[model samples]
Target: DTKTVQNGYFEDAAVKDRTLSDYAGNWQSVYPFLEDGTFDQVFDYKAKLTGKMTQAEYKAYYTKGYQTDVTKINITDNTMEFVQGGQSKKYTYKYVGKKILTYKKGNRGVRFLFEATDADAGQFKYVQFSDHNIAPVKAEHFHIFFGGTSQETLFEEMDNWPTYYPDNLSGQEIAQEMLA
Candidate 1:
């Protein structure tokens, strides 16, 4: 049960010859949750609690998930840790956090678990990997799956992305010169 876009994926062409050497040590997955580009849900929500999102607003800070290539990843035999994608884009908590993965069979869909540790131990609780690696991601991050209304975390969604000054910037005004 993955809560991601029915077709959501960070990588299409596999990492080439990826192996255990790819992940071994501490890492962080800091980034704001985002809605998938492919599909829309009738009942969407942010994965984090919305209580702290009062007057606070956030802009389209862009996807921090792109920063994965910028950082270093440590791979080990007993530990799967690395910097979680989109870490820098977190809303409130910054000091420490984590990300967990679970396969839900029901509505909750797939949920990413964020655990904050000492930040020294990679700020994660534990790394669990499966045979085919059905979902392979860095530390503090994972591939959320839905169990078709079986589990809760499976359907983890943000209560909202918190709008900020959208009426001010038009697509043309903000659109820079770029080839599509």
Candidate 2:
């Protein structure tokens, strides 16, 4: 009994507002699996579903979409820690709002926006989380866009969303989730 929000529909009453806690957890990047060919089977599965792109094409597409230097992310109630090169950069964040983005393919997506409360120089000022959910629900996995001076800049970043899964899941387990 979920009300599915479609494109060009302004149903604010139907949209459930989400907080940062919905995404709080330790997450591991899927970049390594993409590079190591672990996602090839997942791509093949996607291709079979759509028949629009081949496995290799899907791989290439995701290679660009999923690229990220941060290997791990640890999100808490009021802060986020990005782990890259064995070093952690922590930033405090506050939930600003959500942005509804309309794509050229006639579909729309929602990005839960958070602004850094104490972003140092050269650090990310904003973080946007997208989990293919339009309502406030616990995130299973998420694709995040970060490292921008303003919310507009983050919204402009349609490509290259670094995706993450639960840190406890192995590569094989993540692939299985993808296939599922």
Candidate 3:
């Protein structure tokens, strides 16, 4: 079961909206570490990655910055899959509040937690994984996503983003790019 202190902010209605129709578009990672303090490389969500590398192997294609292109993400019931490396991989997941998702592969395998940047904006910001165990929380290890979907309105309303990295572009600039 999901804990109240961590996931209490997420509700079924909001979660369903995000996982279904609202998820179609682009996404970027915000964090870059695993729970164990190891670098989290960008996965081959498309042919954009040379492999997984934290520092040297980063791509800034779609939005002109950040890697991990997550387009056309879909979740059915508890089954989820998305196109990557030209195909989509499916995983079973648990919806935690604050738009946090704990996804498990197969019967007993890798597990990752996808969470929104905060309680207010539902856009994904990071993903946590435990190669050693399926335990959630402790996102010390995470792959950070900048914009998990279209930022048409997110920029104007988002207030949780750090004021550094995205220094070059303004909210309106990013929003304009999203429209193009």
Question: Of 1 and 3, which scores higher on TM-score?
Answer: 3
TM-score top scorer:
2
Which candidate would rank higher by lDDT, 1 or 3?
Answer: 3
Candidate 3, residue 33: how far the Cα is off, in Å: 28
**lDDT tens digits, residue span 1-180, model 1:** 244433233233432222333233433222211233211111112212343322213113224222222132333543332334444211111111122333343322223222222244332332222212323443222222212222333234333111111123332322221001
Model 3 worst lDDT window (10 residues): 158-167
Model 3: CA > 4 A from native: 1-66, 69-71, 99-180
Tens-digit per-residue lDDT, 1-180, candidate 2: 132453334465545678889999999999999999899999999999989899989998999999998999999888889998878888888888888888786567788988887747244678889887778888999999887677778888887999999999999999999898
| lDDT for residue 165 in candidate 1, whole number 0-100 | 14
Mark the 10 consecutive residues where model 1 has the least summed lDDT.
38-47
Alpha carbon lDDT of each predicted model: 0.27, 0.85, 0.31
TM-score of each model, paired residue for residue: 0.23, 0.91, 0.25
lDDT of 1 at 118: 29
Ranking according to lDDT, highest score first: 2, 3, 1
Best by lDDT: 2
RMSD of each: 14.1, 2.8, 16.9
